[PDB]
Design a protein around this ligand. Structure first.
Ligand SMILES: [Ca+2]
Ligand SMILES: [Ca+2]
Ligand SMILES: [Ca+2]
Lengths: 225, 225
């Protein structure tokens, strides 16, 4: 499965057109992806037939959200669901840089039968493996987006392996960050992970302010095949 | 008047606590500010008794929007209005790099009761004094956020002055980006503009991922006034 970040309506459409199979709908690539506005979610869902997973992330300053921010995210999840999203992308850490387990429960309390991707917050956790361990606790989590820790994703091929083992098919894993032409198959097959997440690698000049090049998107899709 | 950027709820709260009397509500300071999520709009407006001006800006690739993006922005205006913002912050250009008047009109066609700030799209126009005469043809446009075109703001101070003259009390100008404590007095005095817009100037550490410094805001109040 090739999942591609979309920051604008034209992204969304070219994603589907070139053969991407899932969209991560964001505002602001520069800040790592934040919750997009009402009308963007609304229209993005209406534009294509491929799944839309919307980012639920109110700012990029940390993953330790106030209780007022947790409620804000719950209310964005509810409206997203109403708007037809295929899932939401989120992740909250406690002060230990580990999974905030009660805050996650509260977030998921409003979820009802869409996917849930715990995102690259999990990479800040001291042990993603133990992070993956604690994640498998929550039934509503269907996916996890990850690069297997910090530094670049190549070195982290073994962690990705272990949590794919750890997940034991429970949670669907998605490699994200530093994903390219060259490493994608190298990344997918060495770890056993079957879903990839890209952004710039398929933008013109690999720029998030550029448009989607339908060339670059299909090149990875076929590599995935 | 000090207008202060908020990117999170605590910014919202702190600007009010610091005596700021308006908020520009955005996500992603990095990309100049984009339309925030449904719940951030609703919770910000609820949280404080000072008016909110919310960004209506789908991305930062351009200020030339597709017709569908116009319609997106229309729907976000209707949404934000129902959530009780005090004003919307929007700007649209055409091929000539002049005010996209049919597109602008379309956007304004759902504005009902609230302010409209035409923003720093105007800085990308070659003689922004021209644009003011045009905007005056649109009675709903209440404010203008500008930095005197490109280049240094106090070095743009003559062009800011040019712009202030045609306002005829029709359009409230707000001095923009580049504002500091060292240069804010000069900028209002010379121009006669009575409103200002500040961002990283009032964050502890001069960063947009940092919290707001109440003293730097209070101070900014205490200098302008
Ligand atoms: Ca759809
Ligand atoms: Ca209020
Ligand atoms: Ca239209």
């Amino acid at each position: 499965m090739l999942e591609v970040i979309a920051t604008c309506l034209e992204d969304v459409k070219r994603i589907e057109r070139a053969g991407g199979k899932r969209i991560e709908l964001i505002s602001s690539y520069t800040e790592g992806g934040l919750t997009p506005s009402y009308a963007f979610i609304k229209k993005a869902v209406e534009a294509v037939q491929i799944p839309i997973h919307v980012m639920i992330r109110p700012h990029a300053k940390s993953f330790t959200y106030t209780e007022e921010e947790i409620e804000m995210m719950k209310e964005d999840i509810v409206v997203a669901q109403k708007l037809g999203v295929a899932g939401v992308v989120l992740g909250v850490l406690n002060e230990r840089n580990e999974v905030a387990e009660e805050k996650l429960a509260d977030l998921l309390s409003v979820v009802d039968g869409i996917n849930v991707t715990y995102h690259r917050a999990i990479d800040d956790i001291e042990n993603p493996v133990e992070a993956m361990r604690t994640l498998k606790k929550f039934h509503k989590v269907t996916h996890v987006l990850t690069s297997g820790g910090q530094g670049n994703i190549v070195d982290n091929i073994p962690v990705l392996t272990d949590m794919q083992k750890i997940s034991d098919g429970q949670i669907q894993l998605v490699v994200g960050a530093g994903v390219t032409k060259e490493n994608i198959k190298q990344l997918l097959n060495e770890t056993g992970i079957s879903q990839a997440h890209v952004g710039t690698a398929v933008r013109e000049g690999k720029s998030c302010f550029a448009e989607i090049d339908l060339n670059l998107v299909q090149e990875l899709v076929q590599i995935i095949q």
